[PDB]
Design a protein around this ligand. Structure first.
Ligand SMILES: *[C@@H]1O[C@H](CO)[C@@H](O[C@@H]2O[C@H](CO)[C@@H](O)[C@H](O)[C@H]2NC(C)=O)[C@H](O)[C@H]1NC(C)=O
Ligand SMILES: *[C@@H]1O[C@H](CO)[C@@H](O[C@@H]2O[C@H](CO)[C@@H](O)[C@H](O)[C@H]2NC(C)=O)[C@H](O)[C@H]1NC(C)=O
Ligand SMILES: *[C@@H]1O[C@H](CO)[C@@H](O[C@@H]2O[C@H](CO)[C@@H](O)[C@H](O)[C@H]2NC(C)=O)[C@H](O)[C@H]1NC(C)=O
Ligand SMILES: *[C@@H]1O[C@H](CO)[C@@H](O[C@@H]2O[C@H](CO)[C@@H](O)[C@H](O)[C@H]2NC(C)=O)[C@H](O)[C@H]1NC(C)=O
Ligand SMILES: [Cl-]
Ligand SMILES: [Cl-]
Ligand SMILES: [Cl-]
Ligand SMILES: [Cl-]
Ligand SMILES: [K+]
Ligand SMILES: [K+]
Lengths: 891, 891
């Protein structure tokens, strides 16, 4: 008990704002998470409007309203449970918990929609506590009284705007000077809720054994208000005379019987039924279907008979019970939905829990369950216990001006009326001390900068200019001055911030964002995708034009935070808004495997530059644009020798020549000019470090060194052999183009001609794919693939029939297959000239010949014999492309 | 005339499909662009439904409907004019013209919404030409006749579904076997439109001089149909007897007068007015306001008097004119909008124009003007010429079953009835030969692959399986079987593809996409933003749930083309969908200036590796994460010496050590490990080529070489001086950290302490910004900036007062300013030890000291005297950061 005393002194229903985030006993799941979440859910819709929803919509449709609204908040509490298990759970509120997991763009768009929903929540709680006062506590204490009979609907709006504005400016002064006394009353406001709920269930159990005696006065079908008179008779007997009652005086003109009366009043008789017959009676089968009506309609009972009258009716003057608002299904969804909001109250105390990754998912989910049980039990127990003609009666006009849910309670009706008065004034205090702390945390965070001032506070950190904005926004909801019109506006901001929490958790799971690994057990991305789809479907049931207003407000807060966050960082905004997009997309790719399922060439094309720096072989850019049809990566890297300290004047000239080609050749790519100490070295740096992160090259395209025997070129010729060794060590493909000056431009178009492929052995996967990619371009469009294979295996048939079903897997059987069959330096170059005689026998005049390229020698002294093997192999051919690669999958 | 004969033989209203794009006299603006665009605009709404819109909505609101719908298509024809002036104007249709400018994602989403809108356009034209046949040509030739009086609304739907299905399967057989004879009739279908428009304006001019004699038969206010009887009298006189007419037989029970009659028929008398009084009479002031009614209501006249009757009414049995559908404002917008669609018909002949960049913007804009003049002139001339009780009459029941717009025409009513019959059958043929060519072009384009088969054709290239899909989609619009319900579905797909054309042209202008430079004069991005906003506002006026269906269909076609286009290219789809995002964002940045307005450090941090490769100074990553708070670019580059051929085993070990730090240090960055021939060279390649494109580093962070005198390190020490020369030649900032082992980690937190800045001269812009960025991190959060300056200028006051207003511009006046005042190798190092005595006098125990760094020597023989100047300057300080840079703006 001594340990249970300082725990209840430690209880508070407040969000940890910005002062708990700058400085960054311990609570449990029950006091830290469960009780603050349950206090912010059970509110004013249960006591004022729930019996009216069960009456108008019936038991079946109002069971469907609660099943949809409690599922949108259950699937959102699973998305909040994924955020609460990811990472460290930073101290201070639910704003810092969301915005560190989902980033500042989703964090600020949720935070400003949760600020606007909390502000109009304080407007609904102030309009709710005036409605309890002026209807049930002291109805005579109203300034603007109706001067005539039809003034009741107009003069009640004037009492709401006068008393609501005077309550709001008084509520804000208590928060500004006495907020420490508001926080001590956090346990009193919980006890007013819990004792009111127990008084309802105590009255339902008592209503089965003996129902209470409440009479409801009927006349035909229609139901008449009990405010003026007391007795339900047309006439009685006093002092030996047939005297008329006070019900006679309201319909008939004079108190005397013979003068004048209403036409409907004469032909029908006054029936007196019981209002709360109990759970023993079978009224549950009666009030099970909907009774939607227009405004001003009567509140009728199905059983009692009446006779219709064609005489005219002004029902406002006579004492009747009339429907105030024209009700629908979509209207009752919008009025009910603020009764389930309060998910985010479970993570107000993220810095004061001993295990926040375990307390936050457990306490919020157990709070949605225990409140959805209360709303689903009350709908069954209001329909089965109250006559449905009393449930259709807002403002309790049939019950002498008493609260309908209060007459059901056992000890007194004053338990609920006092209990709903203090807990609604208390929820207005929490909505007006909790929403300025949220705006101050967003303002001091710096992500939205026009709102920077709202981050000023007092010496202890309490908001000053954030209160003044919140009172002015909450004043516009009091000027609407009805509880039923603020509630669809309120529901629209909570459904909007629940939409982004479910969207951002589903996108970051699919797109594999780094630092998003939620270790919560019952979480799957479809369960947030389904929560996004249901909280979007409820958002267009309520109002479709409130939904487009909320999606355009919150969508423009999202893009404004991107623009100012990139203007702050990468210099200019238009330029910076693409540099943050490229950085954030490359950090996602940083984790995965280098190759997954398919191969496609991503080429580093090497250019040679001469003195008076111009491109030596410009058609090597033309051939790159024919493989890559303006789609993939293309790094254009070239190397000039010398130190960077003195040759950076020539490096600015040579780079402008490369940009001149890539505009004309329509190469949509990148340029990496490097000034290296030797031309050998700088090609070995572009092989291993051209391109950062996910986008790195995959293939190296070169040109054949034509001048084989020269003076200074024997250093430059040897660089060709050692860069074959570099690409095979880095596991990269290599493409050598011979006679690259006689390659087609982009404007030349071949007619007829043939592309000959010679798959001997070793990586025919790439070697079929390269002419298939050329064939899609308009230069190589009308050509034919001939694919040739030499045979040293005995049979040629199963060579061919397996090869013809290689293209059945590859969908390119338009090619035709043919098989041709017939000390180291002696053995190598003799095999070349035998194979040379084979290849020009079938490919003398072809447009392009593809060949496998042999591996470079390992001893390094045979690099002149390896190059003579390649020259003898390729004699008298117009266009040769030599292909080799290492370790890749073509499917 | 001889030149005007082969031009009209060259005229055709067809889109150039895929066969004109594969092979890739000349027409002008008038025949090539203007006439095909005008033929596809003037259609069936002008003849069937325009007089009913003017009657129901009045002249003022229907002037507003045409002003909104012709502005959505005028602002879209300016966005199509920006596409037509960009680039080369590729041959073949409007699909290839849009998708080469806006990319394959916007191109395929527009193309499939323009395919679905063209298919339901063929369903409206077939339901339109059955309605002309069964109402005005032969009303007796109908299969399902109404068995009783109330069967007319139900049996007409059965005639639409039977005749519409038999027309659709017959229309598709003509296209499949005889499409060359359909294309020869393209000039006949234009002449049926133009001769019908001229017959209307010939009748309006004739109606001012003498109006025609058409009687309309009234009885009280309500208007009765003229189908059965002929004469508007209740009784007449024949063979010396008061005989009753045939109007008497339809209301009264028997032909005899005394038997029984209707109650409304007796008390009111039969009035006969003129139906088309002319432009001379002032009916224009009468039918100027709206008359929206419910279904089944009467068609009444304001002037004539009547007496009301309270007896019951079944108006369906008696001969009356009744409103068929309940009309609104939002209903008439959806019915009118298919009368303005046809912008895209101007660019059907992009391959057959002599100047396509000039013809396409001129001919489409002049076609929107000349049709918006026709619809705005007809509304004024229908209201001012036809009595409004005839305009509210669909199906011409008051006018003996004649067409209302046809009775206004001069030569005959049969000019319009025959003319609207052939041009509506002709628009159904063009909608059924033009929509399968569009689907075949999308299918053969390969951007959406589940639809690949639909690209098969005949030998000449005509679609086969694309016809069969189009008939099945057009069959579902005939099963709706009303002209007024297909038209909001039709309008929803055209407004959706006009929404993307206006959106994609506005985004690519703002975000500065490469290869988007439209050289059209009257184009601004706000004029496409305004066209996006109006074609979105019309899209929710028509139906809000048809609008959400079209935005979710077209939004999921957009993301499906992104996913399959990245799965095709970059291997895996999830991985590839981020690599296309990074490539496309870096090609936008490729064009602009390198620095625009502000500076922020984007750092290449250099790591040294020892033998048994581990990071020598791990806190140099910790200090980078405190400047960049997880926001900017961070390249982590390190160099190990040796050839890549043998040390790529150790390069895989050393790279895994770098990834171990960057996970723990929370560095969200990139790793560039380079194996170089010497450690001097590989640092000079990371300075100039680390990072591709827009995201390139800006600052180099190093560590001080502590071991100054060693054995092998005199080569490694000299690399420090020459990399100061490299960063100043590349115009990059440089940061040298001394005693980097004693730097704080991310978890250490300083309490108190001071950051001392010593701005002597030369780039105090960076030197104030560096401790301001550190101060925002939680390590350096509670510190103070002291900023010191030596003075060799005489006065210290205007030094300080200008310096204190340097921070008034920089918003960081929390710092305090203080001024301290008092053969080459003799002159250099004496100045160091004087300045050394100054700096430790004020900064002996500070947490971080910032200093300017002097320029490196030019002669290269003083690199040992430059390093001794830096060591004497920094004696006995715990944490020193030396700062220098070149050529940058800090605002
Ligand atoms: C309304 O109720 C009364 C009794 O509650 C019905 O009965 C009549 O009461 C009058 C007394 O004023 C008697 O004179 C009649 O003989 C009663 N009629 C009976 C018993 O059939 C009265 O009929 C009801 N009014 C209706 C149905 O319009
Ligand atoms: C109760 O009685 C009335 C007539 O005495 C029933 O009839 C309806 O009366 C309203 C007038 O307020 C009309 O608008 C409806 O059209 C009437 N409905 C009919 C004639 O079916 C009324 O339905 C009864 N209430 C019930 C049965 O709940
Ligand atoms: C409808 O029109 C007639 C004349 O077109 C109105 O005039 C009456 O006609 C009858 C002939 O059947 C005469 O006996 C009456 O004397 C006429 N009344 C006059 C001239 O005032 C007739 O009144 C009209 N019906 C109405 C207004 O209900
Ligand atoms: C023509 O006359 C009728 C009555 O003779 C006018 O009155 C309306 O009648 C309809 C019945 O179809 C009612 O629904 C309306 O409420 C009546 N309107 C009233 C009483 O104002 C009718 O308005 C007249 N038509 C006109 C003036 O265009
Ligand atoms: Cl509530
Ligand atoms: Cl909430
Ligand atoms: Cl049309
Ligand atoms: Cl169009
Ligand atoms: K609540
Ligand atoms: K049209």
């Amino acid at each position: 008990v001594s340990s249970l005393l300082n725990k209840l002194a430690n209880y508070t229903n407040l969000s940890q704002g910005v002062v708990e985030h700058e400085e960054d006993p311990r609570m449990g799941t029950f006091i830290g998470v469960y009780l603050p979440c349950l206090q912010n859910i059970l509110g004013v819709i249960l006591f004022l409007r729930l019996t009216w929803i069960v009456g108008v919509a019936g038991v079946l449709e109002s069971f469907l309203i609660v099943a949809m609204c409690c599922t949108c908040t259950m699937l959102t509490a699973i998305s909040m449970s994924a955020i609460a298990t990811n990472g460290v759970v930073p101290a201070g509120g639910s704003y810092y918990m969301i915005s560190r997991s989902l980033g500042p763009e989703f964090g600020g768009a949720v935070g400003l929609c949760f600020y606007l929903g909390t502000t109009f929540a304080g407007a609904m709680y102030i309009l709710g506590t005036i409605e309890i006062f002026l209807t049930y506590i002291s109805p005579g204490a109203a300034i603007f009284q109706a001067e005539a009979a039809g003034g009741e609907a107009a003069a009640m709006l004037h009492n709401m705007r006068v008393y609501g504005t005077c309550t709001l400016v008084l509520m804000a002064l208590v928060v500004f000077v006495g907020v420490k006394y508001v926080n001590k009353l956090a346990l009193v406001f919980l006890a007013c809720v819990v004792l009111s709920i127990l008084a309802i269930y105590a009255g339902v159990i008592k209503s089965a054994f003996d129902p209470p005696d409440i009479p409801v006065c009927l006349l035909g079908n229609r139901t008449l208000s009990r405010r003026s008179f007391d007795a339900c008779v047309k006439a009685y007997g006093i002092h030996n005379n047939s005297a008329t009652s006070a019900l006679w005086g309201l319909f008939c003109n004079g108190s005397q019987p013979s003068a004048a009366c209403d036409e409907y009043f004469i032909q029908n008789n006054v029936t007196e039924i019981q209002g709360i017959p109990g759970a023993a009676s079978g009224v549950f089968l009666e009030n099970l279907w909907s009774t939607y009506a227009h405004a001003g309609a009567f509140v009728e009972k199905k059983g009692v008979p009446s006779v219709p009258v064609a005489e005219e009716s002004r029902a406002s003057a006579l004492p009747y019970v009339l429907t105030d608002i024209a009700a629908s299904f979509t209207l009752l969804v919008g009025i009910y939905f603020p009764s389930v909001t309060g998910i985010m109250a479970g993570s107000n105390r993220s810095g004061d829990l001993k295990d926040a990754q375990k307390s936050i998912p457990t306490g919020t989910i157990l709070a949605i369950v225990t409140t959805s049980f209360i709303y689903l039990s009350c709908i069954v127990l209001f329909g089965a216990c109250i006559e449905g003609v009393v449930l259709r009666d807002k403002f309790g006009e049939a019950l002498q001006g008493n609260l309908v849910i209060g007459m059901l309670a056992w000890p007194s009706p004053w338990v609920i009326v006092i209990g709903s008065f203090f807990s609604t004034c208390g929820a207005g205090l929490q909505s007006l001390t909790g929403a300025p702390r949220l705006l101050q945390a967003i303002a001091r965070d710096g992500i939205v900068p026009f709102l920077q001032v709202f981050g000023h506070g007092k010496a202890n950190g309490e908001p000053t200019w954030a209160l003044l904005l919140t009172v002015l926004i909450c004043e516009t909801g009091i000027l609407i001055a009805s509880l039923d019109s603020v509630a669809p506006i309120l529901s629209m901001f909570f459904l909007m911030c629940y939409l982004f929490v479910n969207l951002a958790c589903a996108v970051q799971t699919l797109l594999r964002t780094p630092n998003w690994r939620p270790r919560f057990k019952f979480y799957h991305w479809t369960l947030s995708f389904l929560g996004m789809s249901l909280c979007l479907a409820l958002m267009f049931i309520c109002s479709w034009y409130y939904a487009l207003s909320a999606m355009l407000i919150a969508g423009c807060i999202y893009k404004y935070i991107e623009y100012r966050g990139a203007e702050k960082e990468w210099g200019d905004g238009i330029r910076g808004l693409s540099l943050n997009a490229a950085r954030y997309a490359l950090l996602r790719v940083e984790h995965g495997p280098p190759h997954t399922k398919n191969w496609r060439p991503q080429v580093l094309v090497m250019l040679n530059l001469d003195a008076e720096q111009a491109v030596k072989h410009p058609r090597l850019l033309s051939f790159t644009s024919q493989l890559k049809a303006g789609k993939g990566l293309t790094i254009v890297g070239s190397v000039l020798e010398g130190t960077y300290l003195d040759k950076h004047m020539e490096a600015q000239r040579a780079e402008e020549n490369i940009r001149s080609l890539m505009s004309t050749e329509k190469t949509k790519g990148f340029c990496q000019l490097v000034v290296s100490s030797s031309l050998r070295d700088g090609m070995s740096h572009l092989i291993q470090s051209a391109g950062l992160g996910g986008l790195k090259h995959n293939t190296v395209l070169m040109a054949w060194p034509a001048s084989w025997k020269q003076e200074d070129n024997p250093f430059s010729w040897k660089n060709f052999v050692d860069t074959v060794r570099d690409t095979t060590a880095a596991h990269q493909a290599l493409l050598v183009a011979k006679n690259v000056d006689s390659f087609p431009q982009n404007q030349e178009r071949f007619g007829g001609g043939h592309i000959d492929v010679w798959w001997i052995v070793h990586d025919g996967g790439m070697l079929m794919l390269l002419p298939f990619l050329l064939r899609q371009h308009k230069v190589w469009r009308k050509c034919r693939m001939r694919i040739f294979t030499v045979a040293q295996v005995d049979d040629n048939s199963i060579q061919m029939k397996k090869d013809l079903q290689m293209f059945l897997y590859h969908l390119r059987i338009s090619a035709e297959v043919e098989v041709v069959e017939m000390q180291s330096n002696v053995r190598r170059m003799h095999t070349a000239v035998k194979l040379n005689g084979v290849v020009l026998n079938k490919s003398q005049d072809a447009q392009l010949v593809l060949l496998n390229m042999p591996g470079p020698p390992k001893n390094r002294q045979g690099d002149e014999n390896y190059m003579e093997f390649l020259e003898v192999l390729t004699e008298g051919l117009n266009r040769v492309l030599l292909v080799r690669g290492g370790g890749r999958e073509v499917i």
